[PDB]
Design a protein around this ligand. Structure first.
Ligand SMILES: N[C@@H](CCC(=O)N[C@@H](CS)C(=O)NCC(=O)O)C(=O)O
Ligand SMILES: N[C@@H](CCC(=O)N[C@@H](CS)C(=O)NCC(=O)O)C(=O)O
Lengths: 218, 218
């Protein structure tokens, strides 16, 4: 059975937590990566993939042809029996999910604004309230759902990576989160991935973004 | 066993699709509604509910204490065996979910901007691409996942309701969506709900929003 395909821009963006989950699980996959100058190339292929809701990212494995980043990461998790063993645990994991997205989408939704520098002040003013809930969550816990890794762990990791670019001191007040970020980096298969040529360091958002864009870090 | 509690602002906002699902399922529930002048009241209660990630909406039923609107609607769906019977169907439903949220969050993310009137032009320019995928999806289908209702049907319904306020003609080119909206309204338990005193007609977003705010429609 062939390697499934993960299609996306050559950026971190929406799919970075999925990459980390895949690498955590030591799953084989191949990426179809779209470059900065391949917009027309993508548009010419977008409607020729059998996708119900054509978009990036997409995931194709011979059983599914998916779009929506959260459907994709949840499918991979689900195929490894990680979404939760009953309605209460599935709800817990979806709740963790959404709370992470409040941070990650909080970034994405202002990153392309001409008025980023201003909107950034409001986001960073609210951010400690969001981080505090995760700091608390990690009291005497190894991962967000206890002693075992779940996909929101990699979502949170990505969110922390990204907000540190917006303000390198924003975790100084949250030592358990700083520790969590290091703990994820100390998973050997993640360590190996981050050191590999498959790791995409930059950009964070699309290249044209005001925050987290461009070909290289500022 | 007592009526579960759904807590939220007295607005449509993030929770309207959940209300519709509950009413579809003819489930008993009570809402704790926060009014426009009850911000301090909420802030004084927010951290005293046993919530891991305090926020609005919340859902409490004696088995769970949830936040995150999508965790909540998925829990209710899950308790009625509606999330999908296998990984492929669960992924399909999550994909529908996300594609709806691209429209609904597309609105929410610009609705509080001082620059709404400008951002609105871009959103409405892109909107037909998003609607087209649903128009296509509904070719010879009664609901988004075929012959039976799923929670993204009510998410889509809410999204259509809302974008019609932004532009009353935006569905003129999508007759299957206009029909879908009427078909949802023709579910007798939804018809009854929309005519009831429990229905909240306005606002769409928070009261202070530039779009979909205020005490009454413009
Ligand atoms: N809600 C969707 C949003 C997808 C999206 O906005 N993709 C952007 C890149 S971050 C894109 O370029 N899509 C390509 C297209 O619209 O054709 C998701 O989570 O996957
Ligand atoms: N991602 C969260 C966002 C929740 C959110 O932004 N809630 C707003 C109203 S739409 C609020 O007033 N929360 C109250 C608070 O932050 O204390 C969700 O889907 O539930």
């Amino acid at each position: 059975s062939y390697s499934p395909i993960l299609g996306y821009w050559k950026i971190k963006g929406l799919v970075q937590p999925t990459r980390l989950l895949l690498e955590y699980l030591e799953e084989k996959y191949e990426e179809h990566l779209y470059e900065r100058d391949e917009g027309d190339k993508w548009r010419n292929k977008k409607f020729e993939l059998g996708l119900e809701f054509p978009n990036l990212p997409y995931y194709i494995d011979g059983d599914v042809k998916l779009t929506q980043s959260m459907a994709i990461i949840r499918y991979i998790a689900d195929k490894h029996n990680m979404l939760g063993g009953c309605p209460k645990e599935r709800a817990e994991i979806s709740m963790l999910e959404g709370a992470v997205l409040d941070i990650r989408y909080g970034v994405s939704r202002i990153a392309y604004s001409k008025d980023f520098e201003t909107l950034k002040v409001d986001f960073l003013s609210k951010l400690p309230e969001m981080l505090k809930m995760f700091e608390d969550r990690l009291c005497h816990k190894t991962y967000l759902n206890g002693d075992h890794v779940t996909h929101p762990d990699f979502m949170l990791y990505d969110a922390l990576d990204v907000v540190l670019y917006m303000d390198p001191m924003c975790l100084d007040a949250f030592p358990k989160l700083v520790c969590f970020k290091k703990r994820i980096e100390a998973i050997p298969q993640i360590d190996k991935y981050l050191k590999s040529s498959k790791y995409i360091a930059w950009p964070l958002q699309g290249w044209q973004a005001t925050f987290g864009g461009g070909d290289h870090p500022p």
